[PDB]
Amino acid sequence: PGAISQLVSYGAQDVYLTGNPQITFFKAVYRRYTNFAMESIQQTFDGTTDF
Amino acid sequence: PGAISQLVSYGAQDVYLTGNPQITFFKAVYRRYTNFAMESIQQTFDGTTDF
Amino acid sequence: TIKLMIMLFSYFAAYQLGKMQERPQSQWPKAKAGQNKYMVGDWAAWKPIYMGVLGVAVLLTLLGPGGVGGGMGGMFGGGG
Amino acid sequence: LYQDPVWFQDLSVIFKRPSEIIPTRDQSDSERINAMVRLVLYCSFAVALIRQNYLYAILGLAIIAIISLAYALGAKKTKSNEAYGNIRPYSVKRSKKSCSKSSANNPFSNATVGALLDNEARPPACSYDDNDMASTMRKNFNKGLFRNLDDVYEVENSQRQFYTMPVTTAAPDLTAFGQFLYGSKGKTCKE
Amino acid sequence: QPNGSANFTRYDSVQLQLTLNENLASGRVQIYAPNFNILRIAAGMGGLAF
Structure with missing residues (x-):
């Protein structure tokens, strides 16, 4: 029944999707990233800022 | 102050995020690709094109 | 066999043009797409x-x- | 920044790890001395084995000492193997590129005014990872400075602000930059 | 995929200053701050790691 039936009724046409697999969608892996942080910094205008 | 405060107040609860970095977000990487070009070419119908 | 053994080394000494060595500069690491390998260090x-x-x-x-x-x-x- | 492969001189025990090199070619002077050491050791040991008098090995070790001592003492300090610009004509053989190592007065070798002091022509401060100068840099920065012992990945005493500037010589070496952006391409179609 | 974080665990004291408009009713400012932790599971046993 349910998902178990979908798992048990294994065929031939599905080997291309699940036989000798490389990935499990349900194993999260993330990369460690270089420490960085962002800041909004004001820059100023050289010359009049107008029309 | 600023990003410095965020970077400098380095703790323990961030080791698993930035220690021994694996990815630098600031290094763009792209892969070179197979040379190709695309063209729209008209094909014609064999037989009447009607209702 | 002195003359011969020294020449055997001489012949071989000449021949091995080239120099094998340990990898220079820095070693490098590969990054999984995020499925199928164990992280280097457990997050915990x-x-x-x-x-x-x-x-x-x-x-x-x-x-x-x-x-x-x-x-x-x-x-x-x-x-x- | 210019990088070269690894080598070492006959001290330690390197004379066995890349074994079976006898005579010099396209090798550094230290590697050439190592190859001569290999020649002498194998020759003398083989001669001692052929004629079991146990003294040809002694003479081989003695001449090893002679060659190594000559190389150690007779080296000429008049080397200016500094690579920059378009030409490096001093030598084409394998050699260690000159580096301006970090110093107490200039922890990061930023060539602020040290260039005008004594060097005049100052070799570039080579890469952060070349010769373990990262440890020396950290030691020099942490000279006379107290830490609060709340940061074992020390960022609290403002490591990040300090760094090596992109150029560490008197001149930016614009020729190398231009060759980087615009290759010579050797003999081109117009020629 | 983590793209940066602020380790508030080392911010001994944090304050957020709001300059308010002149026409607000008395009420609440509800402040949310999604953060990171590690789900720590071993030998049948769970729990969330700090």
């Missing part, structure tokens, strides 16, 4: 190494004049 695991590193840092600080202060007072000693 990473914090402990942080903690392990501290053992060394604190031990250095058991001698004030040898390094950096601690959380109170100070301590003295020396070697021999």
Whole structure:
């Protein structure tokens, strides 16, 4: 029944999707990233800022 | 102050995020690709094109 | 067999043009797309190494004049 | 920044790890001395084995000492193997590129005014990872500075602000930059 | 995929200053701050790691 039936009724046409697999969608892996942080910094205008 | 405060107040609860970095977000990487070009070419119908 | 054995080395000495060596500069690492391999350090695991590193840092600080202060007072000693 | 492969001189025990090199070619002077050491050791040991008098090995070791001592003492300090610009004509053989190592007065070798002091022509401060100068840099920065012992990945005493500037010589070496952006391409179609 | 974080665990004291408009009713400012932790599961045993 349910998902178990979908798992048990294994065929031939599905080997291309699940036989000798490389990935499990349900194993999260993330990369460690270089420490960085962002800041909004004001820059100023050289010359009049107008029309 | 600023990003410095965020970077400098380095703790323990961030080791698993930035220690021994694996990815630098600031290094763009792209892969070179197979040379190709695309063209729209008209094909014609064999037989009447009607209702 | 002196003349011969020395020449055997001489013939071989000439011949091995080239120089094999240990990889230079820096070694490199590969990054999984995020499925199918074990991280280098367990995420729970990473914090402990942080903690392990501290053992060394604190031990250095058991001698004030040898390094950096601690959380109170100070301590003295020396070697021999 | 210019990088070269790894080598070492006959001290330690390197004379066995890349074994079976006898005579010099396209090798550094230290590697050439190592190859001569290999020649002498194998020759003398083989001669001692052929004629079991146990003294040809002694003479081999003695001449090893002679060659190594000559190389150690007779080296000429007049080397200016500094690579920059378009030409490196001093030598084409394998050699260690000159580096301006970090110093107490200039922890990061930023060539602020040290260039005008004595060097005049100052070799570039080579890469952060070349010769373990990262440890020396950290030691020099942490000279006379106290830490609060709340940061074992020290960022609290403002490591990040300090760094090596992109150029560490008197001149930006614009020729190398231009060759980087615009290759010579050797003999081109117009020629 | 983590793209940066602020380790508030080392911010001994944090304050957020709001300059308010002149026409607001008395009420609440509800402040949310999604953060990171590690789900720590071993030998049948769970729990969330700090």
